[PDB]
Ligand binder design. Structure first.
Ligand SMILES: Nc1ncnc2c1ncn2[C@@H]1O[C@H](COP(=O)(O)OP(=O)(O)O)[C@@H](O)[C@H]1O
Length: 205
């Protein structure tokens, strides 16, 4: 089956092909329609199966491009992974004129993040910086409808970002979709995600 059978919009289809993604991987076949349906997803599959591309594709297909507002928030456990996500979104979104996707990490002045957030469809960042930006109302979360956790195991493990993610989650609108993707699903992650997803759909190979 091809990407067309997944009912993606033409700009996303064209972007996928331009970015070198000719046919969906098994996890993409399963997860993309469920993502388009608006369901909360837990996608658990090993590294390299295509999970980053899954959520990036669901995200881009969901965007109202003509509304220059932050509709999608994506968290990553490291600065490098935040940038990797940005690279994937920018590649697949290459046919979407005026797409604004930006990375929010430590080391840039907050005043510059403030300016960048005035033109930002998709915010990608680390939990600490994103929390700070929401607290300052530099990122007003009122237009966010899709909240994505990449490497959710690493995000929510002991000594990581559960407190900040709980806080961010609570700041978001009541009505929203969440996606969590992870290589593993240990008890701590199963338990943590009950805070955010009432009755998630699981996607596994
Ligand atoms: N449909 C596809 N066709 C070809 N290559 C793909 C496809 N989806 C992902 N890839 C590539 O496979 C690798 C792993 O994808 P990624 O989305 O990073 O997986 P994960 O997040 O599960 O580790 C990357 O190099 C990515 O560019």
């Amino acid at each position: 089956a091809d990407f067309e059978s997944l009912l993606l919009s033409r700009p996303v289809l064209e972007g996928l092909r331009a970015a070198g993604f000719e046919r969906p991987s098994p996890v993409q076949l399963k997860a993309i329609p469920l993502g388009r349906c608006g369901l909360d997803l837990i996608v658990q599959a090993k590294s390299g199966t295509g999970k980053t591309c899954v959520f990036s594709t669901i995200a881009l297909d969901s965007l109202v491009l003509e509304n220059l507002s932050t509709q999608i928030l994506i968290l990553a456990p490291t600065r490098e992974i935040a940038v990797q996500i940005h690279s994937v979104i920018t590649a697949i979104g290459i046919k979407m004129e005026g797409l604004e996707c930006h990375v929010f990490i430590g080391g840039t002045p907050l005043s510059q993040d403030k300016t960048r957030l005035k033109k930002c469809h998709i915010a990608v960042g680390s939990p600490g910086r994103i929390k700070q930006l929401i607290e300052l109302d530099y990122l007003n979360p009122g237009s966010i409808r899709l909240f994505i956790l990449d490497e959710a195991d690493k995000l929510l493990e002991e000594g990581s970002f559960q407190e900040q993610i709980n806080w961010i989650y609570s700041s978001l609108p009541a009505s929203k979709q969440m996606l969590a993707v992870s290589a593993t699903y240990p008890e701590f992650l199963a338990n943590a995600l009950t805070k955010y997803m009432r009755d998630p759909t699981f996607v596994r190979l």
